[PDB]
Write a protein that binds this ligand. Sequence first.
Ligand SMILES: CCCCCCCCCCCCCCCCC[C@@H](O)O[C@H](CO[C@H](O)CCCCCCCCCCCCCCC)COP(=O)(O)OCC[N+](C)(C)C
Ligand SMILES: CCCCCCCCCCCCCCCCC[C@@H](O)O[C@H](CO[C@H](O)CCCCCCCCCCCCCCC)COP(=O)(O)OCC[N+](C)(C)C
Ligand SMILES: CCCCCCCCCCCCCCCCC[C@@H](O)O[C@H](CO[C@H](O)CCCCCCCCCCCCCCC)COP(=O)(O)OCC[N+](C)(C)C
Ligand SMILES: C=C(C)[C@H]1Cc2c(ccc3c2O[C@@H]2COc4cc(OC)c(OC)cc4[C@@H]2C3=O)O1
Ligand code: SF4
Ligand code: SF4
Ligand code: SF4
Lengths: 96, 156, 70, 215, 115, 318, 176
Amino acid sequence: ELVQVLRRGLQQVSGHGGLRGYLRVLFRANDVRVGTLVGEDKYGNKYYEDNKQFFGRHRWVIYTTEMNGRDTFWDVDGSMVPPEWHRWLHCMTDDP
Amino acid sequence: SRGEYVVAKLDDLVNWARRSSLWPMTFGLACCAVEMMHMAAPRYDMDRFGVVFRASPRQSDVMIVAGTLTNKMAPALRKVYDQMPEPRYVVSMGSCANGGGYYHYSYSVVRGCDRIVPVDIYVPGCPPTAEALLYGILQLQRKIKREKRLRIWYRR
Amino acid sequence: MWFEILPGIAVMAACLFIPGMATAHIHKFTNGGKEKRVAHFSYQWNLMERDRRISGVNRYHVTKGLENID
Amino acid sequence: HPAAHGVLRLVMELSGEMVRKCDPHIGLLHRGTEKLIEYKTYLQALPYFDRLDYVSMMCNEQAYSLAVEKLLNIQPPPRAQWIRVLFGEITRLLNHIMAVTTHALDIGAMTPFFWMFEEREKMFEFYERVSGARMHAAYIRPGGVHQDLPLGLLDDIYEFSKNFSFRIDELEEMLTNNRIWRNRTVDIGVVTAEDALNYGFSGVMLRGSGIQWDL
Amino acid sequence: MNIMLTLLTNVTLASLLVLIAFWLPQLNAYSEKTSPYECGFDPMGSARLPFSMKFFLVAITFLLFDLEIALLLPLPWASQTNNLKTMLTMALFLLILLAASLAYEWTQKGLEWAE
Amino acid sequence: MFMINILSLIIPILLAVAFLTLVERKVLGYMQLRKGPNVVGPYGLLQPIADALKLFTKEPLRPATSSISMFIIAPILALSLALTMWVPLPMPYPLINMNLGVLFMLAMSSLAVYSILWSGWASNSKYALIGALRAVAQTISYEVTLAIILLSVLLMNGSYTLSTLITTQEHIWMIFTSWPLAMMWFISTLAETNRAPFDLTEGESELVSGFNVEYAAGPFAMFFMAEYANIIMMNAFTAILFLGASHDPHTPELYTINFVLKTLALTITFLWIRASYPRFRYDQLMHLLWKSFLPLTLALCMWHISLPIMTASIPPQS
Amino acid sequence: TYKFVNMREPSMDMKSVTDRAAQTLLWTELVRGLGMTLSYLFREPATINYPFEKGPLSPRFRGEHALRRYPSGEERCIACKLCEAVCPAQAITIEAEPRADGSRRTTRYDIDMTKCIYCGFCQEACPVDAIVEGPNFEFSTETHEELLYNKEKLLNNGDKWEAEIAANIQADYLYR
Ligand SMILES: CCCCCCCCCCCCCCCCC[C@@H](O)O[C@H](CO[C@H](O)CCCCCCCCCCCCCCC)COP(=O)(O)OCC[N+](C)(C)C
Ligand SMILES: CCCCCCCCCCCCCCCCC[C@@H](O)O[C@H](CO[C@H](O)CCCCCCCCCCCCCCC)COP(=O)(O)OCC[N+](C)(C)C
Ligand SMILES: CCCCCCCCCCCCCCCCC[C@@H](O)O[C@H](CO[C@H](O)CCCCCCCCCCCCCCC)COP(=O)(O)OCC[N+](C)(C)C
Ligand SMILES: C=C(C)[C@H]1Cc2c(ccc3c2O[C@@H]2COc4cc(OC)c(OC)cc4[C@@H]2C3=O)O1
Ligand code: SF4
Ligand code: SF4
Ligand code: SF4
């Protein structure tokens, strides 16, 4: 029913660390989905998956806000992924 | 100073507006145009970044040189580049546009489109993947974010 | 999602709401709080001019009832 | 021009909007491929055939490989030939999708392009898995194929193939019985069988006129 | 008076938008930029050369058909007359003659464009 | 105080046009299995603002071969007329109350074709001229049929006053009385607004950009604003004409909400149509309007003249 | 073996004629197309959230080039010049000499990335797995000169991407 969809949205905003974390993820990645934390990167990037999404949307990375020297709160790019997480993220392998 | 703060804020607003609405000219030459189409395809959906193709050069902001530029075709590319109103940007996509590529040693091929027009971003690959072209476009957006025209005018 | 199109439609609906309610409220404000008089024909215009003349304040919508018959 | 399908300078003499004369000017994508091929070895000249027709890449590889195999008097192994035919049919699907969707886009129907280019993306994934390149595989070689299939490619090709007919059905629902599409396509550009034969046409351009010919 | 004010406001807003469009940005106009657009190559002839109209007869017929709607537009008020039979006869006569003129033009190939 | 009403009508219309573009892009995207603008602002809500700011800070180009006066005048006329067509619409009270409001819209819509004509001719380029001539053909195709349809529908209203249409449809919608006329009116409104499948004047796949191929930056923005304002205005006119919302004199915002919802439904139907069909040929459009719509419209005009007399159902007004 | 695509004759009975007239006058197939688009509107789009989500790739993927080392830290390249001879675009330039310890090593190893067609022939030709095409594809530059790789840049690429390059090679070397 529609009420269950609304409840899914409410638990989605609840599970992102509250309202401000929800807004942070919405304005940083234009996505508010919740996934299992596969792992964390030594530069601050976090990697999540959810196998219920279709192939392509089942793995993602929330980038760090502070890379080597630059502020990456808004300025992010795919080149910031390290090679091992690069292999995992592009589905060249199944193992993290 | 107040004037410096004001020009910085207006500069940021104009940079945001220009990078958030980038309209490439509907313009392709060779193999690389297929990957450009796949970038426009639903999987990548460049339109979600505010990137919309437009046929007329007068209503365009970016020229993606996607394919070989030959000697016969170079004047036409230069002409449709000149008819773009400013500010205008050029992305060189693929080996053929970047430096000639497979046809570098040819009697009929221009060794890189940068001999004809100034180039902002070079996207390597033969062809670059649609993801690579998207990376290049976002890099162009970052470069537009870095530019400071109002600050330079104020410090004059 | 398809429900992501809804915010833009809502903004358009909010924008399109404003003209009608603004017109209605301005009509009420400038016509004594009781709707703007419609004069499609000269008889209605004559009625409006008579209302303005007998109002004593040169405003047609100022209505004089049975308190003007001594 | 969006309808130019690339670099074509069609000089047209018109009376009003009626076309009095067409003069196609080509050579805006003449790169001198044949001289360059004359400067390469047979393996070095193979990737040029990828870039000849950049919608039917593996079919061009197959044609060149067949020519070189005939000149060498050798024979590809059976598994290589089955792989060649399978990927040639996948390439035919890619080419026909591109042709039909760009034709519809030129006519004015822009929607089927987006529906079918996701299937094109999946077939690009097949290309990349077999070769490491989504478009220019250089996979079919004058001795067979470069590498064997990865250990799970056939299952994915089967999964893709068992859902494509519904996409074709949706495309046909959009176009086949549409009176606007029929108005824009029926009786337009009619060519007779004898004219098609004398003018050197091939493929659909013959079969549309009733000529029964398939290589 | 209110309609005149509305027209003045709309025209003023549009003209102001044009003025901001032409005076806010930085202009770099050179001869190559302002040249006419014909897909990258120079035009052969002029755009002020005659351009054939293949629907010229339909265009001429449009004038008479446009005056017919001007004739037919007072029908809502005409339907309030006491001589309803006469008004209905004349309205149907006018529409029948319009339909007959359309039929005559159709049958004699008047609606086909010139080749 | 009337100036305030003018502004309260003008600014929201432009805002709705700006966001209509975002809605148009998103609807097309989701109907094409993609998303459309969702990065510039949450759910792409700031994309129209970025487009407007980018367009008006870009260099406007004045062609060397162009006629300067008409070239500059045409977009001004387009946008001013697009804004002017809204003033007689009752929502439920019009800003301007006209005895003949329908004739006013007819005349102003007839005068809005000259912005495309003068723009195309004054550009002094071949594609612009082809677009202008296509506009001439389009008007010749649709004008007579649209006028006769309007007359046939309004025969049951009793006048050309737009507010009377609210009184006429107090109990039933006029679409249940004249649905055959409503279908032809909808198609003619598609043809009149230069919308797919009747977007010949632009013709992106055939004419690059058509009549406005030489326009850039702000004047191009004004042409776009005029076109989308015309879309919204025409769909609002259709909603008033055929789907009459109930009006409570003490509760007018109920009517306003109902009318806005119907107008949005019709506009979304326009966007839906654009994503489903191929483009017509302009000679085929003329033949469709003159060989199919015109005879049926003439017959239905005779029928809608005879019917109120036949059943003693003539509307009140003189 | 052939079939006809447009050789069917319409039925001329009164019911079929009336059905065709209803299709002509009430626009049934146009509503069918509208229904198809409406059905698509309610499906989940195929778009991914780049750059936070990436398109799937393969261990065979051909991206930016890299020069590799042995586990001891010694370079694998011995300057045989097979990759330079096989390069269809003549994108590789090599100069070699005996090293101070007598080893056969390069003194110049350039790849022009604006000449390269990314065909992977060089890594097929290499007998020691010295030159590879790595998995990286996001290396767009702002200048043409940044795409003219010398030996230092390629060695740097190898050191940077070796962790993924070795894993990709391990998953595909049995097909080679
Ligand atoms: C009364 C009005 C008069 C003027 C009318 C004009 C309209 C008003 C202007 C509208 C303001 C909206 C712009 C603000 C949008 C910023 C969004 C934000 O996200 O941008 C950030 C940075 O924002 C910009 O740096 C600053 C924007 C605005 C700066 C100053 C604004 C001052 C405006 C005040 C009005 C001045 C008008 C003067 C004429 C009267 C970084 O985003 P970005 O990296 O890109 O996106 C990366 C995408 N990722 C996240 C998914 C990876
Ligand atoms: C949204 C719709 C409503 C808006 C409401 C506001 C309306 C605003 C009006 C629209 C115009 C906006 C233009 C904004 C920039 C100003 C351009 C011009 O006026 O400035 C200069 C005007 O200066 C002239 O050079 C001459 C100045 C002095 C000579 C004549 C003026 C005499 C007035 C007396 C001034 C002395 C002090 C007065 C104190 C009050 C011309 O410079 P120019 O390069 O060409 O044009 C390009 C402008 N660029 C550089 C920003 C790109
Ligand atoms: C004697 C000549 C006959 C043969 C020659 C033919 C040449 C003449 C062409 C046709 C002649 C008809 C014209 C007669 C004048 C009509 C006016 C009069 O007869 O009364 C009208 C009667 O008109 C009726 O509608 C019936 C006559 C209409 C005939 C239908 C049209 C046929 C004309 C076809 C010939 C024209 C050229 C060819 C066209 C196809 C209305 O009367 P009523 O409204 O009570 O009172 C009005 C006064 N009020 C207002 C104060 C109350
Ligand atoms: C408009 C969107 C949906 C897509 C389609 C499209 C682009 C971008 C550019 C072009 C384009 O289509 C046209 C027509 O079809 C081909 C076919 C071509 O070769 C198959 C080819 O090569 C240069 C070029 C073209 C045109 C052109 O460059 O994005
Ligand atoms: S770089 Fe490669 S894919 Fe791109 S146009 Fe040249 S040959 Fe074709
Ligand atoms: S990938 Fe091919 S073109 Fe590039 S350097 Fe290696 S052999 Fe040469
Ligand atoms: S990279 Fe490999 S093929 Fe090239 S010179 Fe070195 S060892 Fe030989």
